[PDB]
């Protein structure tokens, strides 16, 4: 059996000085099942590769343990030398389709059963049989969620800075004209004090109408001050979370909201056949990044507004770090499975055992104890 180091499902960790790994416990106190892992010491190429004994554990390995207990299996788990699920590469005489990774190892006889997170595609299923899926997770939209804050940070009126000068000159001219009209059939500052006290909330016939018109002038100022703040507050929403591929925001990508794939993920192949995504391809091709780790680092660094990847990784990253929250309902859903050879006689028994475990609620307990950790 060969397995790939997948952080949400496979926790590959080095052993101790005694050759075995330390035994930990979960939140419920149950011991963590571990199996001796065999694989190369260095994943990167051009290194003195050594098949040192590692120690891997997780949800898929727990499922493998259950299958071994219920189906009379004795297994030794391995690691992928190439480090990829397996596609078609180009070699001398490129007109020959040669597999790599897990699929190539299975077809070459190196492995006999693959219990890991391998997606079920028609091209993969043409030569390698797949079993019943464990759980169905389709790729979603990942965006960064930030604490809401008011965007009305401004001084000297929202947009008309001359309004303060206008009201100042108005309160000066009304005061001077009140002083002028006072000498008719209260000398230095009483008019200005009264004007300030009637404009703000603080303690013959010409005076009455003057006070009425100045009160009317004061009312509209505070009315506009409340109205602009209310408008800013009701428009204070930064953006609305993407509900899926049908969101009009995604259909017209711009410089204000950039999102793209990595390079040639089963995602790029799917988008190639979609002729209706010409607008998508006119913008996503200029924002591709070399690796998913680099892409998610850029997203965390406020470089890419949104990132598109399988839910099995994005949801785990969101659970681990609350700085990112997965959005979108679902689109282009797929499922996992077990990679077995076409002549393997274990197909029916493996399918029956997986169905029985799924109906017994074991899958939900494993998801709770291995996928969803410290929900934000």
């Amino acid at each position: 059996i060969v397995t790939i180091h997948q952080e949400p499902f496979v926790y590959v960790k080095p052993t101790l000085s005694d050759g075995t790994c330390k035994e930990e416990f979960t939140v419920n106190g149950d011991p963590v099942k571990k199996v001796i892992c065999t694989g190369p010491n260095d994943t990167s190429p051009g290194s003195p590769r050594h098949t040192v004994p590692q120690c891997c554990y997780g949800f898929c390995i727990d499922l493998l343990i259950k299958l071994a207990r219920t189906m009379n299996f004795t297994y030794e788990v391995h690691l992928v030398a190439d480090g990829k699920f397996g596609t078609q590469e180009r070699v001398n005489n490129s007109n020959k389709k040669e597999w790599n990774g897990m699929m190539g190892e299975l077809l070459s006889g190196q492995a006999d059963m693959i219990v890991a997170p391998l997606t079920i595609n028609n091209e993969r299923a043409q030569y390698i049989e797949f079993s019943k899926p464990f759980k169905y997770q389709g790729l979603t939209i990942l965006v960064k969620k930030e604490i809401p804050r008011s965007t009305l940070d401004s001084f000297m009126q929202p947009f008309q800075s001359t309004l303060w000068l206008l009201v100042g000159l108005s309160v000066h001219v009304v005061a001077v004209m009140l002083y002028l009209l006072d000498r008719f059939s209260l000398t230095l500052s009483s008019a200005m004090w009264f004007s300030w006290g009637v404009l703000l909330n603080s303690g013959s016939f010409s005076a009455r109408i003057l006070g009425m018109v100045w009160a009317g002038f004061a009312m509209i100022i505070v009315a506009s001050y409340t109205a602009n703040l209310a408008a800013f507050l009701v428009l204070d929403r930064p953006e609305e979370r993407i509900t899926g591929i049908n969101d009009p925001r995604l259909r017209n990508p711009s410089d204000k909201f950039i999102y793209a794939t990595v390079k040639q993920s089963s995602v790029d192949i799917y988008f190639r056949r979609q002729v209706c995504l010409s607008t998508m391809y006119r913008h996503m091709e200029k924002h591709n990044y070399e690796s998913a780790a680099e892409a998610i680092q850029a997203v965390r660094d406020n470089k890419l507004h949104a990132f598109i990847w399988d839910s099995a990784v994005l949801e785990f990253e969101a659970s681990q770090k609350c700085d990112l929250v997965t959005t979108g309902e679902l689109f282009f859903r797929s499922g996992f499975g077990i990679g077995m050879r076409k002549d393997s006689p274990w197909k029916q028994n493996v399918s029956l055992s997986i169905l029985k475990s799924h109906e017994n609620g074991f899958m939900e307990d494993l998801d709770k104890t291995w996928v969803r950790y410290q929900e934000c």
Binding site: S170, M177, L181, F184, F205, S206, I209, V213, I220
Partner: peptide
């Protein structure tokens, strides 16, 4: 807004008219 200046000018015109009327009375 543009309407605010028009409204305040209309109010000031009425205020000045009333002041002139009460002065000439």
């Amino acid at each position: 807004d543009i309407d605010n200046m028009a409204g305040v000018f209309y109010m000031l015109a009425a205020a000045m008219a009333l002041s002139l009327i009460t002065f000439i009375w």
